[PDB]
Design a protein around this nucleic acid. Structure first.
Ligand SMILES: [Cl-]
Ligand SMILES: [Cl-]
Ligand SMILES: [Mn+2]
Ligand SMILES: [Mn+2]
Ligand SMILES: [Mn+2]
Ligand SMILES: [Mn+2]
Ligand SMILES: [Mn+2]
Ligand SMILES: [Mn+2]
Ligand SMILES: [Mn+2]
Ligand SMILES: [Mn+2]
Ligand SMILES: [Mn+2]
Ligand SMILES: [Mn+2]
Ligand SMILES: [Mn+2]
Ligand SMILES: [Mn+2]
Lengths: 98, 110, 95, 82, 97, 112, 98, 87
DNA sequence: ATCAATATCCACCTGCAGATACTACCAAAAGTGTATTTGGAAACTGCTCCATCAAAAGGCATGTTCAGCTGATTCAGCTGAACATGCCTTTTGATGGAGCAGTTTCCAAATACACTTTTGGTAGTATCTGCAGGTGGATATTGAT
DNA sequence: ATCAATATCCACCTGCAGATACTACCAAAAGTGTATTTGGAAACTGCTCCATCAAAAGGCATGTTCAGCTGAATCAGCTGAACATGCCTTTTGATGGAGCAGTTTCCAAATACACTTTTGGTAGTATCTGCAGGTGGATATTGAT
């Protein structure tokens, strides 16, 4: 029986995904969450295919970026594990809140 | 008889269309004959610059067709293009392979 | 069925001068178009401000220049400023 | 088996985004924290998009609506026009 | 030779100040910040409006542009109130000719 | 019977002015008669909201004259004005008194 | 011979300075740094005293602003002492060299 | 003429005592020795980026005097909009 | 070290999704010839920026001392990473109709004109008055013992 | 938990700097009210392309196991805070000079404008082919032993 050690697949997933550009959230569940949030602003809305795809590209871009700055915040506190407090520090310093 | 302002200034970029867009962009009441030439040139140059580097990234990856992934690698690996576009996302760009050192495995006999 | 203008003709011309045996996906072509519109607006706009700051009703090449100085980094700026000044000279020097 | 839409953004999806952002190791609390951030993003962006839609007297949110939104939210997106 | 006329919003900010705080003065510095504030917000709106008109192939900025631009630029309860005070002053100005 | 547009609209803020500034920035080919009324109102409205919160700060510091420090305490203590003016610097404004918890002394008993 | 313990006068100064709005950089040293840097861009320049003061206002505001974020980064690392690496993490996440 | 006296090392006029006062306003309690040099550096970059733009406006206007408005337009461009000096 | 279990690379193939290539027709560029508008060229202001210097407080530089913070060490227990499914959601593909967008119409509302009126910004003056900063003097706050 | 040093607070008191204020008043705005066009709301359709929906298909929810991470407790060295001392620089307030922004008048270039002549660029079409995976097998990486 064979077993890769904690972090080894992780590093592998990093390399794999830093090499690709394909979106990483499944399309439908994103499309539902978009249509839901929008309903709170105007009812019976329709969404051009491209408009959702635009939103997803922006949205994933944003998060990937925030995970960089998060990971730099974790690392700063001599950790290798991102925690909420790290996402929090990044979004504070980015000017996004507090 | 009818010369192109493009061909006159010796540009691929359309000095006519740039002039029109400057008039009808509410940028000012009046637009000098030179401005849309100058601009057309600056857009051409910068287009040339990026395609060059991208072309090179498509060659680095054994490919003849430039894709977004090539434009991202071109821009984000050039210090001066990366500053200019620092506030821009390229759809289907991904990111530069980059793994913080401390996250790499111990390694060596020691 | 109405005409949706782009810059994709002149991107493609400028591709073939620079990499005559290199192509471009539609998606890349779109990014290039966003790019040209983006920088167009950035320059036109800074030039708009400059004209207003100096109570001038006219954007000239002089505005486009200062603009390009303010918006472009160091080396990009120099090389755009040249490419501009050249194209203007070439256009003047053309009966 | 009804489940919230925000929970449609699954741990393995969030893990994948974190991986692209160079994250090795992920606290269990990240996935909710992340969904909350992702929600605020979309709210902030979609609100502005729809506001453009309603100005244009349309019931269809266009790519351009989103792009114009994303531009005034400082997140400018290349490849969807404009 | 006669120094040129440099107009401000000072007259109007002062009238409003006395409406809300009849016994409260304002420093020439603070009145400075208050001028730059109006000038700033004026542009931000006029801008968004300018754009928005364009985005829909309209050559005319109307009170309908001004309002959308105000919903885009102001957060929550400032927007609601600013849209009221607008709509109201327009509805009045219309019926007040 | 010259009757101010400002007065016609029920405003302090000068509609005539706001119509002329919209023309001179151009911003578009034409300016609707309602635009500079709506805008002069929104401007009046926002200056009012600030002056009320500033005056309050002035009163809170036993002053009769609003200075910059006052305006700053107003803009920064209001969640919605803070976000509007998030990327703005008020000369002579200072910052809000704010010391991170962890930095405060802990030499007393208190915690058992 | 009485002695306030390390960090009691510091806290006293935080209250003192957060309470005031006067500029904390001596005026003249700052005016020379402005003429020095400018001259190196273009010679024979003159400065409206208000232009020098505009710069000083922005600079102090920027610095005070940076120091808030820096302090956060220090604290994030379970320290109370700001170090270069805090200033750097702050300016990375701000996008001043991201 | 007199030719102006030579300007050099003026960044050292941002004294250790002025940098602490600023950090105090930013609510800082303990300051490493290495901060003062780091801060001088950051300040110098900031000042350069602003003065460059400012002077770019001054030159565009064909003035030899940098105005308060040149600094304000420069600060606005850098996304550091300043109230209290005109515009 | 060995040995293997699994991941990774590379060379080759090939159908087709998605390029490039081709065509015609028309919006919008360019040519021509008036019809306005502007932004230096010269010629003067007065302002305000520069420099100078003298006096003196006021803050800066420096050296000493040690409180307490940082960063190193060691460690136990907790918490995510790894790992395999079949079931459940997503994805894929094709149908009907919502609605965007193309188009013409026409009138309320916008621009342009050239008068008339009012205003707000000014320079000149006077004229008040909020509060800056200074003094006691009463009242916390801190830190040692 | 007492007390001593010292920082803090607060409430009055002056003498300004800066605010408020009386015009004077007048150049530029604002606005009044004709005479334009003319932008765009409105109504109608047609043809995209969007929501739906049911078959095809491949990720993810699931519990167990333990590797190794985080965070806790301890300690030592040394850094940075505090403070005393000496004194250099900046601040403050003039002055005289002049450099140079900021104004005002001619207009000769420079754009705008209305019309006409042509054509470059788009959008349908019509073909062509880069490479996305699929296969085979060689090799590297990892991890247990
Ligand atoms: Cl020109
Ligand atoms: Cl209107
Ligand atoms: Mn009131
Ligand atoms: Mn092989
Ligand atoms: Mn000494
Ligand atoms: Mn253990
Ligand atoms: Mn229908
Ligand atoms: Mn008056
Ligand atoms: Mn006092
Ligand atoms: Mn029409
Ligand atoms: Mn040690
Ligand atoms: Mn001059
Ligand atoms: Mn042709
Ligand atoms: Mn392949």
């Amino acid at each position: 029986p064979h077993r890769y050690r904690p972090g080894t697949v992780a590093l592998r997933e990093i390399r794999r995904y830093q090499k690709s550009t394909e979106l990483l959230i499944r399309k439908l569940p994103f499309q539902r969450l978009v249509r839901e949030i929008a309903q709170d602003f105007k009812t019976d809305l329709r969404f051009q295919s491209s408009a959702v795809m635009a939103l997803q590209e922006a949205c994933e871009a944003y998060l990937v970026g925030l995970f960089e700055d998060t990971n730099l915040c974790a690392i700063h506190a001599k950790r290798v594990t991102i925690m909420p407090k790290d996402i929090q520090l990044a979004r504070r310093i980015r000017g996004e809140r507090a | 008889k009818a010369k192109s302002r493009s061909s006159r200034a010796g540009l691929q970029f359309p000095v006519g269309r740039v002039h029109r867009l400057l008039r009808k962009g509410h940028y000012a009441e009046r637009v000098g004959a030179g401005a849309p030439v100058y601009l057309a040139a600056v857009l051409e140059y910068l287009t040339a610059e990026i395609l060059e580097l991208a072309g090179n990234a498509a060659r680095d990856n054994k490919k003849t067709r430039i894709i977004p992934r090539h434009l991202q690698l071109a821009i984000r690996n050039d210090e001066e293009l990366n500053k200019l576009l620092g506030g821009v996302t390229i759809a289907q760009g991904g990111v530069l392979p980059n793994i913080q050192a401390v996250l790499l495995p111990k390694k060596t006999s020691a | 069925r109405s005409r949706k203008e782009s810059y994709s003709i002149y991107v493609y011309k400028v591709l073939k001068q620079v990499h005559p045996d290199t192509g471009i996906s539609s998606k890349a072509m779109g990014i290039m178009n966003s790019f040209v519109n983006d920088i167009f607006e950035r320059i036109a706009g800074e030039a708009s401000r400059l004209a207003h700051y100096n109570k001038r009703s006219t954007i000239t090449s002089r505005e486009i220049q200062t603009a390009v100085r303010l918006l472009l980094p160091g080396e990009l700026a120099k090389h755009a400023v040249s490419e501009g000044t050249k194209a203007v000279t070439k256009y003047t020097s053309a009966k | 088996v009804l489940r919230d839409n925000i929970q449609g953004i699954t741990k393995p999806a969030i893990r994948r985004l974190a991986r692209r952002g160079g994250v090795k190791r992920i606290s269990g609390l990240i996935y909710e924290e992340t969904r909350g951030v992702l929600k605020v993003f979309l709210e902030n962006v979609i609100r502005d998009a729809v506001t453009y839609t309603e100005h244009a007297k349309r019931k269809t949110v266009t790519a351009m609506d989103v792009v114009y939104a994303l531009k005034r939210q400082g997140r400018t997106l290349y490849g969807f026009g404009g």
